[PDB]
Amino acid sequence: GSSGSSGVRYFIMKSSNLRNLEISQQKGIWSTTPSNERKLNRAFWESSIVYLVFSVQGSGHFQGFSRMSSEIGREKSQDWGSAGLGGVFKVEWIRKESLPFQFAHHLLNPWNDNKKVQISRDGQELEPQVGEQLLQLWERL
């Protein structure tokens, strides 16, 4: 058997406007800054699953989460309102509702700074121990 075996990585994605994410939740695709794509491509080829948690800047909420469904630069799209973005990839959405930051206030991010999960950057890594508890919170809505 494999020395690495089955396993999943967790990441916080960020948006400049909820309108850019409306395309993502309808078309089933996403796009990030070119400097993140190498971490997500590596994670996608190594892992069983790559979890991508969504957050619009200034919203006070996590907009949902998806699983990475294809590799970056294999897919393309002209649909974006923001133009500072890189290439495109497919995403498989699991939950799509705006979860308040208050729900995850008992959770932290030791892979950032041991800060509260809301205090995470565009492409910031998340521990699986805090992240597996974050994803269950959509079931409380």
d(CA 97, CA 31): 20
Using CA atoms, how far residue 113 sits from 54, 67, 108, 118, in Å, is 19, 24, 9, 12
Residue appearing with tokens 């805090």: 130
> Which is it for strands 61-62 and 99-100: parallel, antiparallel or unpaired?
antiparallel
**Burial state string for 6-31 with b = 16 or more CB within 10 A and e = fewer than 16:** eeebbbbbbbbebebbebbbeeebbb
- Measuring CA to CA, which residue among 79, 70, 76, 82 is closest to residue 122? 82
Method: NMR
* Signed CA dihedral, 69, 74, 80, 83: sign only: positive
User: Any idea how long the chain is?
Assistant: 141
Chain center to CA of 22: 15
d(CA 141, CA 131): 17
Residue 129 corresponds to which tokens in the numbers above? 């121990």
Residue 64 corresponds to which tokens in the numbers above? 């949902």
